[PDB]
Structure formats: C-alpha cells, structure tokens
Design a protein around this ligand. Structure first.
Ligand SMILES: *C(=O)c1ncc(Br)cc1OCc1ccc(Cl)c(Br)c1
Ligand SMILES: *C(=O)c1ncc(Br)cc1OCc1ccc(Cl)c(Br)c1
Lengths: 296, 299
C-alpha cells in the first residue's frame, strides 16, 4: 500500500551517460551503439544568437573530447540533426540497452536521470501542457535525458536549457524542441500552463485504491465548463476511455470521478494521499503500474 | 533551478537484487559477495511464528535463489536477528563497494522497490520519528532495500511488513527500526514532524526564490521548542542548528530567524499560499539533501 512519486530504475541509462567537451563548454551526452547524442549548444562559446551551421563548420572531430568514465572515445564523424549533435565514435557502447527514441505527448510522464560531467546525481519522475517541465536542473545538467522503460528504454527527452522563469525545456532524441523554444539564450515565452485533467482523475483513483475516499459523492460537457474556469485541460472521450481500467478496478464510473473533481475545484483543508493540492503528474498508466507493481 | 524529491541513481543496487523462494513464499534478496540477505519470514507458511523451530525443518536445497536467469547454489544458511543469511557458491560479480548502516530517525534514503527480484521503481523516503516509513510496497516487495550512495553504497533498510498502512523493517543486520516484530498482529509511536528537515526545506525554498514566508521576528531555541512541542514537531537541538550552518551562511539567514518564520507558519497556517509548489510543510529533505541537490553532488 501507499503511493509515491516513483521513477523508473535508472541503471540502464547510467551506463549510457558520458561527458562531452568542446572548448571550455562541457555537458552530458548519451552514448548508444557507436553514436553520442548531446545538445548542439556544446559548440557555443558569447554566442545569444548562435548561427549553428556556421559554428559547426569551424569545428573538427579533434575539438570533441568525449569521456566515458575514465576512458576517452575517438570521434570519427559528426553531424547535426535539428538541435542535437550526433558524434560517431569508434567503439559501440557495450552497455547499450534495447532502446527506442520517442516523442511524448503533453501530460505524459517520464523519469529524469539528472547528470553532471557525465555522472549521475539523482533520478525523479510530467511534460506540462505548455511543453515545459518542472524539474531540478543546475548549470551542467544539459544533456541529461528523460525516459520510460517497457526491458527496453524509450528515450523521450534531452534537457537543453533553464528558462528565466525557473522551468526547463528540451528536445526529443531527434533534436526537435518540445514547445516553441529555440536554443538561444534569450527571453522566451512559455504558454499559459494548464492542469492535466486526466492525470488528476487518475490520482483520485489511486487515492480511492489506497483507502482515501472522502471526496466521493455531472456530465462531460458540464465538467469541461467548470474545468475551463479553473484552468484545467478539457477532458475528452479518449481521456475517459484511458481511465476505463481504473474505473473497472474501483467500481467508480469515470463521470462520477469527474463529479467528485467538480466539487473539489469549487470548494477546496483535508489532504488526499497526504497532499493538500491536486496532483497532476501521475498518468493512468503510472497509477496502474505502481498499484499492480509492474517490474522490469 | 527547481527542487524535486530526488532519489539516488539505482544501478549499483539493481545488480544486487535477487529472488528468493522457500516453499510457497517468494520475495527479494540482497546479494553482496557470496551472501544473499533477505527477510526471515521467507520461511513462514505467521500470526505467531516460532522462527528457530521453523528454521530447523529447512535445509540448504529448500532455498531457491535466482539472479536474473541464473540459479545460485546455496551452501549455507543462518538467521541473524530478523534477516536470513544465505551463503552461495558464487560471489556477485556486480557487488559494489558497500557498508551496512543503521540510520537515525528523520534521515533520508532511496528505496528500490522490487518484485520477484526485479526492480519496479525508485523513490526517496525518510525514516519517520516513530521509525515507520510511508512507502509504496505491494505484496511481494519484502526484501527491497533502502540505501544512500557516497561510489560506495551504504545500505540502511530492508522492507519487512505493512502495518494495518505504513511500513516497517530492519537494518541489514536484521534489527528492526522501532519496536516492531515479524508477526502479523502492533502500535506505532506518535509521528512527529522532523523539524530540522522542515527548516532545511525552507532554506531550499529561499534559495529557489520563494521568500514570502520570511518574517520580521526572531526567537530563541527554547521559545521555538515550546511551539514545536505544541504542534507535534521534533525538538530542535544545537546539533540541528550546527547542521543548518552551511544553509544559513549561503542564504544569509540566521537559523533562529528561520525558526521564527517557521513559528509563524505553525501558528498562523499558510493561508492557501504555497512554498516550492507545496501547500504543506515538507520534512523529507535533510540539510544534506538540500545541499547535495542545490550544488549538484554526483556519484
Ligand atoms: C545546460 O544545462 C549546460 N550544461 C553544461 C554547460 Br558547460 C552549460 C550549460 O548551459 C549552457 C546553455 C546554453 C544555451 C542555453 Cl539556451 C542554456 Br538555457 C544553457
Ligand atoms: C512482503 O513483502 C512479502 N512479500 C512476498 C511474500 Br510471498 C510475502 C510477503 O509478506 C508476507 C508477510 C510476512 C510477514 C509479515 Cl510480518 C508481513 Br506484512 C507479510
């Protein structure tokens, strides 16, 4: 029993972290087969408005110092795919897990292995609707990755920057930014964020599953009118079918839970799962995984 | 920037996790060198088990130890306090540098939750003052361990049981934390808040820009402690004050000043405001935890 914010076991990703060095700038990289992936701004020196194509031309393999623990690795080719730099090394990573690269959707969750100088510092478990993440990232963490595990690791996130507002932005493993952000040190606006409605519902189920039922007691269209006032993501029929298994195990219909949430937004000093705010960083899949103890 | 509850990277502990089966019972074990450690109730068919006389009826080959796909051969078995020790014929090639430590109430650690010898997830926990842990443990999780990392892994906790709904267990020598025993029958203490941790978390908040709670008062260790008692908070000691030094100097706020701010939050409540994204006072970060995260300690 009990319910915690749970990250995936991180060992399979630890053996993929490397230190990437270019000039003074060093950051974290991801060594998979014979390729090291890292943020392209590792080639940035005073360069606010980097012309990355121009900058990468001034650069040669020799200027790329990749360190895998102690041992250095030889760079034998380099390229830019959108905002990631791909450094072809001559040794395939022997600790390479089965993996895929994936682009997740707003509201889905993943584990971040926060890393500095190619070495793991900690791991924690959402992509916000506005495509930021509320993480814990210090200067030097660039290149840390987010991932889910299915024995196969789905890499979904590579950390690129700390925004002035204290939230963080990055790319999938093909270098496409999540959200409107660019890899320039300029002021950049994130959207209005919203609360992830189907995740809050999922967490209300985890609450019932763990014995916290006091919030129990509407219709889809009635609900979206109240949720829009409180800055909640609209709830779609897809979201309702996603919550189906939790409804089945609890015996509480999806639109009943939505009625419970309506009253919760209108009225508010009690706790739910020992929190005094509504949590939206648990997906329905997260709730099922933890409450039925999926292993890897 | 930002501040999360952060667990240690779990890979070194992942390579030590095994499955241990005895009759109808399967749980997790910790395999370091040529020894596997697991809860002794692995041999229980409970309510009031006579553990010595249940161990009598057991031989080495009654213990199935599985490491991934490999079967290990059990050449010895003994019981130390509430853990069972199983000698196997093959040292664990992946044994990290490790120590066994008994931690103190209010210290934190990472739990690698496990089923059938396989990991499910990792989360950061604190030993409550009543020596329970508010974990996430389903049936089968017994044997999962809690740890801190220094490249050395110090194991502090092994999961044993769910009380009627928090969690109880032992250090790696099999001594329970708290007054608990391994029978299905038990009242935990009164759970106080861990004051030095709440203080450190207020320091973390200040470091991250949340300063609205900073007040115009000071107080005294004794004046503060009187209020701590009233609100079921742990007494604050000079040792706690000295542990807060680095955070006091980094932020330039006297510990006793932070204490006065906390006194105002305890007496006036929070008024629907939040601190570091939480609308409660958090006490599962140690001063060390705050420092490691804010400075980026690696392993
Ligand atoms: C990012 O975390 C990072 N990591 C290592 C080093 Br050395 C420097 C870093 O920040 C540089 C940086 C460049 C461009 C942007 Cl947009 C940001 Br935000 C940070
Ligand atoms: C506990 O995690 C566990 N795991 C697998 C199996 Br099979 C049985 C388990 O516990 C049963 C049990 C024995 C003794 C106590 Cl004191 C408790 Br709670 C549970």
């Amino acid at each position: 029993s009990g319910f915690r914010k749970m990250a995936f076991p991180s060992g399979k990703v630890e053996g993929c972290m490397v230190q990437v060095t270019c000039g003074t700038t060093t950051l974290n990289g991801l060594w998979l087969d014979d390729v090291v992936y890292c943020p392209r701004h590792v080639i940035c020196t005073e360069d606010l408005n980097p012309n990355y194509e121009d900058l990468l031309i001034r650069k040669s393999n020799h200027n790329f110092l990749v360190q895998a623990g102690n041992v250095q690795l030889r760079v034998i080719g380099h390229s830019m795919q959108n905002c990631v730099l791909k450094l072809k090394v001559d040794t395939a990573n022997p600790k390479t897990p089965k993996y895929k690269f994936v682009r997740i959707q707003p509201g889905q969750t993943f584990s971040v292995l926060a890393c500095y100088n190619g070495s793991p510092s900690g791991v924690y478990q959402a992509m916000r609707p506005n495509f930021t993440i509320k993480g814990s990232f210090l200067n030097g963490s660039c290149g840390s990755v987010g991932f889910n595990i299915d024995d196969c690791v789905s890499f979904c996130y590579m950390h690129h920057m700390e925004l002035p507002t204290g939230v963080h932005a990055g790319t999938d493993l093909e270098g496409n930014f999540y959200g409107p952000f660019v890899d320039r040190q300029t002021a950049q606006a994130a959207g209005t964020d919203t609360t992830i409605t189907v995740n809050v519902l999922a967490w209300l189920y985890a609450a019932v599953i763990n014995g916290d039922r006091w919030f129990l007691n509407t219709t889809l269209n009635d609900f979206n009118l109240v949720a829009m006032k409180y800055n909640y993501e609209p709830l779609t029929q897809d979201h309702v079918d996603i919550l189906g298994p939790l409804s089945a195990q609890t015996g509480i219909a999806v639109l009943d839970m939505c009625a419970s949430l309506k009253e919760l937004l209108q009225n508010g000093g009690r706790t739910i799962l020992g929190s005094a705010l509504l949590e939206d960083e648990f997906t329905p899949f997260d709730v099922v995984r933890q409450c039925s103890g999926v292993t890897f």
